[PDB]
RNA sequence: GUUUAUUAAAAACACAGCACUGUGCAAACACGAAAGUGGACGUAUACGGUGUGACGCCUGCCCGGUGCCGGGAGGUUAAU
């Protein structure tokens, strides 16, 4: 494919490469997510002066704004005080919805789709490490303290 | 109990009736009934598809609550009713808020027992709860396939599923026929065995118990014609062939299980 | 029916010529697939049942040109 | 009421949650109108054979006078729990004292 | 009880019972180029096919051929 790239892909993307990829990776991942534009004799002219000169640094400062969105919450901790079972065995397993609502109500305003859970649905009541996908390289180290009630 | 009838006439000799004395003798709860129109084994095209059914006594559909969407609500079992479309009995249960619902009646259930539903349900039989608070090794029924489906497995009379393994978010179950398979741990189940376990002991006595139920007499392949069945023909009780279906598919041993979508869920096949 | 939206492909009839040249009428069916396109000119999802050759044509052309051809032919998108 | 000598083992990270279970069990004892006799926690020590792995389980003795309904409910809370592994209830025999 | 309406009402068909086989639900199977239905608003004490035909005594041998199932070590093996 002659598809020119826009985002910093962690394998072959370095802001302006013409690396040959398959059509299924371009049509289903790069195009609908805005990651890359298929270049056929006019998008090269679009990327030549209008995109690589101005909009690449705009994407870089939007990545810096995502880093600042990570740097909104300086506490980086969430104390969940939901109802629990008798001596452990928590009542309801907390997914990404309640964690995203607790971070959005006080702290980072990131959406639910960037929230990742390394330790499952967090059935164990205690200290847990939760990372956020605010950026493809810089990750979060949120310390969630599940407290039994 | 299971009462064998006396041979007062030719036809009542082999009648063995399963008489439950605790069933309510009266009309059921009317807003939970709807119509159940008979089909006779015919599709929208009007041709017969599932043969050897038709006729019999009429019946009305009872809306039996499968999902148990109420959580944290106590439930007092009002009475027991006989569902004609099932093999086991159903239970009319009056909830705390005043809503009467039909559920599947377990084995250890009488008039006056208290059950509940939700994740805060106990280990007492009759409670419906998801498969992440149940101790591994007990007996469950009304097994849901997907979270929120309602329940597909272990719902006939006497059918029960024992929990074998718990691999993270997967629950490996042993079914009634003996097929090990994995389901989602978020699926719900009702504790205990399904009641009316003596329902297999009825041997129906006569042809009339097959006729008024909906079982039509079955014609053998030897009695048919070569244009009507692959078997048949010959000058007097000649078989001379291999046992097949009337549509040319081999029977008495042929694995037709071919979907290739739920083979990951199946652990060990039926033996 | 089995009509491609972009290329207009439809099933035709042919012969199933065996080793003994036995002419048996059968039907040639196109490789139709219902794929959901992200359109940037409309910024939305468009479900199209198209052929994979039509998918290669859309991979060559722009999606706005394909939607313009569907508008010119009066097809619903 | 009869004297019941309860011995149960607990898993270690759940043996960190033992005193709350002791408070719940003595609340059930107070509901049984019986007096507690042996609050001696034997503690976390080494097992003799592999019993549901991660060795060195937690021994607790109770030894309380209780009726039959309360001990049936307290046995069902034992058998239906992943925390309590190998509980047992024994005879009366004029319930006993120090130097276990 | 039913059957060749219009030469055969029977030992024929069928029958509850018994056995084998398949199927974990969007099930098998069937109608339908397909959608969609029956099965079933049932789900392994259920359904479909086969064989026999209440009940008592029972059902002995053989996997050579054929049919079915399992295993892929090896030989052969088209399409690309």
Q: Which residue of D has its CA nearest to A148?
A: D17
The sign one gets for the Cα dihedral C20, C24, C30, C34 is: negative
B206 within 8 A of B11, measured Cβ to Cβ: yes
Q: What superfamily in CATH does domain B1-113 come from? A: Nucleic acid-binding proteins (2.40.50.140)
Residues 6 or more apart whose Cβ sits within 8 Å of residue B217:
B52, B207, B210
Please check whether residue B22 touches A, CB under 8 A.
Answer: no
* Shortest Cα–Cα distance, D56 to chain A (Å): 21
Residue B123 and residue D76: Cβ atoms within 8 Å?
A: yes
**Of all residues in chain D, what percent are helix, strand and coil, respectively (each to 5)?**
30, 25, 45
Largest CA-CA distance found in chain B, in angstroms, rounded:
72
Instruction: State the CATH architecture for B195-271.
Output: Irregular (4.10)
Identify all chain B residues contacting A93, using CB atoms and an 8 Å cutoff: 132
Chain E nucleotides covered by protein, CB below 7 Å: 12-18, 20-33, 35-55, 66-70
> Residue B105 and residue B77: Cα distance in Å, rounded?
10
B115 within 8 A of B127, measured Cβ to Cβ: yes
Rg of chain A over Cα atoms, rounded to whole angstroms, equals 20
**How remote is the C-alpha of B58 from its chain's centroid?**
19
Q: Which residue of A has its CA nearest to B186?
A: A93
| Fold type of domain A69-148 | Ribosomal Protein L9; domain 2 (3.10.430)
Chains that touch A (3 or more CB pairs under 8 A): B, C, D
Q: Which contacts of D24-28 are long-range, i.e. CB under 8 A and separated by 24 or more positions?
A: D24/A86, D24/A87, D25/D62, D25/D74, D28/D70, D28/D73, D28/D74
Token code pair at residue D84: 């309590």
SS3 category, C54: helix
> Residue A145 and residue C72: Cα distance in Å, rounded?
60
Token code pair at residue A126: 């205690």
Residue B135 and residue D82: Cβ atoms within 8 Å?
A: yes
SS3 category, C38: strand
SS3 category, C26: strand
Comparing CA positions, the residue from A60, A65, A74 lying closest to residue A140 is A74
| Residue C10 CA distance to nucleotide E34 C1' (Å) | 15
Residues 6 or more apart whose Cβ sits within 8 Å of residue B232:
B221, B222, B223, B224, B225, B226
Neighbours of A140 (CB within 10 A): 20
> Of B119, B168, B169, which has the smallest distance from its Cβ to A92's Cβ?
B119
The sign one gets for the Cα dihedral B114, B116, B122, B124 is: positive
SS3 category, A37: strand
SS3 category, C64: helix
Residues 6 or more apart whose Cβ sits within 8 Å of residue C1:
C10
What would the DSSP string read from start to end of D81-93? -SSEEEEE----S
| Residue D100 CA distance to nucleotide E65 C1' (Å) | 79
> Residue D48 and residue B91: Cα distance in Å, rounded?
50
Sheet holding B139-141, edge to edge: B128-130, B188-191, B139-141, B161-167, B170-174, B180-184, B266-268
Strand partners, D10: D58, D84
Please give the method by which this entry was determined.
cryo-EM
> Residue B139 and residue B174: Cα distance in Å, rounded?
10
B101 within 8 A of B28, measured Cβ to Cβ: no
Chains that touch B (3 or more CB pairs under 8 A): A, D
Q: Where are the beta strands (DSSP E) in D1-100?
A: 2-4, 7-10, 41-44, 58-61, 64-66, 84-88
Name the residue closest to the C1' of E14 by its CA. Answer: B217
Q: Are strands B170-174 and C12-15 parallel, antiparallel or unpaired?
A: unpaired
The domains of chain B are located at 1-113, 117-194, 195-271
> Residue B47 and residue B42: Cα distance in Å, rounded?
5
> Residue C17 and residue C23: Cα distance in Å, rounded?
5
| Residue C14 CA distance to nucleotide E76 C1' (Å) | 34
Task: Please enumerate residues of B whose Cβ is less than 8 A from a Cβ of D.
Answer: 123, 135
Sheet holding A127-130, edge to edge: A77-80, A142-146, A127-130
User: Which residue of B118, B120, B134 is the best one to mutate when testing the A interface, meaning the one whose CB has the most A CBs within 10 A?
Assistant: B120
D touches A, CB cut-off 8 Å, minimum 3 pairs = yes
Name the residue closest to the C1' of E12 by its CA. Answer: B223
Domains of chain C: 1-77 (2.30.170.40)
């Amino acid at each position: 494919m002659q598809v020119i790239l826009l985002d910093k892909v962690a394998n072959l993307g370095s802001l302006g490469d013409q690396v040959n990829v398959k059509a299924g990776y371009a049509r289903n991942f790069l195009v609908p997510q805005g990651k890359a534009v298929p270049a056929t004799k006019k998008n090269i002219e679009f990327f030549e002066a209008r995109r690589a000169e101005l909009e690449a640094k705009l994407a870089e400062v939007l990545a810096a704004a995502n880093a600042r969105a990570e740097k909104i919450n300086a506490l980086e901790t969430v104390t969940i005080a939901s109802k629990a079972g008798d001596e452990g065995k928590l009542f309801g397993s907390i997914g990404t919805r309640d964690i995203a609502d607790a971070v959005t109500a006080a702290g980072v305003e990131v959406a639910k789709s960037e929230v990742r859970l390394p330790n499952g649905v967090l059935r164990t009541t205690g200290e847990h490490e939760v990372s956020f996908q605010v950026h493809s390289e810089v990750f979060a180290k949120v310390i969630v303290n599940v407290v039994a009630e | 109990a299971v009462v064998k009838c006396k041979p007062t006439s030719p036809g009542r000799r082999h009648v063995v009736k399963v008489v439950n004395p605790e069933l309510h003798k009266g009309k059921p709860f009317a807003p939970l009934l709807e119509k159940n129109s008979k089909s006779g084994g015919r599709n929208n095209n009007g041709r017969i598809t599932t043969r050897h059914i038709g006729g019999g006594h009429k019946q009305a559909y009872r809306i039996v609550d499968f999902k148990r969407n109420k959580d944290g609500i106590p439930a007092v079992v009002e009475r027991l009713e006989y569902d004609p479309n099932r093999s086991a009995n159903i239970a009319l249960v009056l909830y705390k808020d005043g809503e009467r619902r039909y559920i599947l009646a377990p084995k250890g259930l009488k008039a006056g027992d208290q059950i509940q539903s939700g994740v805060d349900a106990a280990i007492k039989p009759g409670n419906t709860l998801p498969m992440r608070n149940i101790p591994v090794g007990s007996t469950v029924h009304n097994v849901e396939m997907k979270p929120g489906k309602g329940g597909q497995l272990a719902r006939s009379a006497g059918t029960y599923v024992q929990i074998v393994a718990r691999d993270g978010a997967y629950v490996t179950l042993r079914l009634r026929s003996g097929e090990m398979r994995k389901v989602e741990a978020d699926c719900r189940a009702t504790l205990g065995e399904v009641g009316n376990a003596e329902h297999m002991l009825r041997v129906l006595g006569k042809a009339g118990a097959a006729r008024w139920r909906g079982v039509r007499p079955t014609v053998r392949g030897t009695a048919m014609n070569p244009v009507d069945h692959p078997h048949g023909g010959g000058e007097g009780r000649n078989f001379g062939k291999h046992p097949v279906t009337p549509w040319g598919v081999q029977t008495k041993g042929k694995k037709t299980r071919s979907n290739k979508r739920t083979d990951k869920f199946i652990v060990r096949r039926r033996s | 029916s089995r009509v491609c939206q972009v290329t207009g492909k439809r099933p035709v009839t042919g012969n199933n010529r065996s080793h003994a040249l036995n002419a048996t009428k059968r039907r040639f069916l196109p490789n139709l697939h219902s794929h959901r396109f992200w359109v940037e000119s409309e910024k939305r999802f468009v479900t199209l049942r198209v052929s994979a050759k039509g998918m290669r044509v859309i991979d060559k052309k722009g999606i706005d040109t394909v939607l313009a051809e569907l508008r010119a032919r009066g097809e619903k998108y | 009421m009869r004297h019941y000598e309860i011995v149960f083992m607990v898993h270690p990270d759940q043996s960190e949650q033992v005193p709350g279970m002791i408070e719940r069990y003595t609340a059930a004892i107070t509901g049984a109108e019986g007096k507690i006799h042996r609050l001696e926690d034997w503690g976390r020590r080494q097992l003799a054979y592999p019993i549901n792995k991660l060795h060195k389980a937690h021994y607790v003795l109770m030894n309380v006078e209780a009726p039959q309904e309360v001990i049936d409910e307290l046995e069902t809370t034992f058998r239906f729990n992943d925390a309590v592994i190998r509980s047992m209830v024994m005879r009366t025999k004029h319930a006993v004292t120090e130097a276990s």
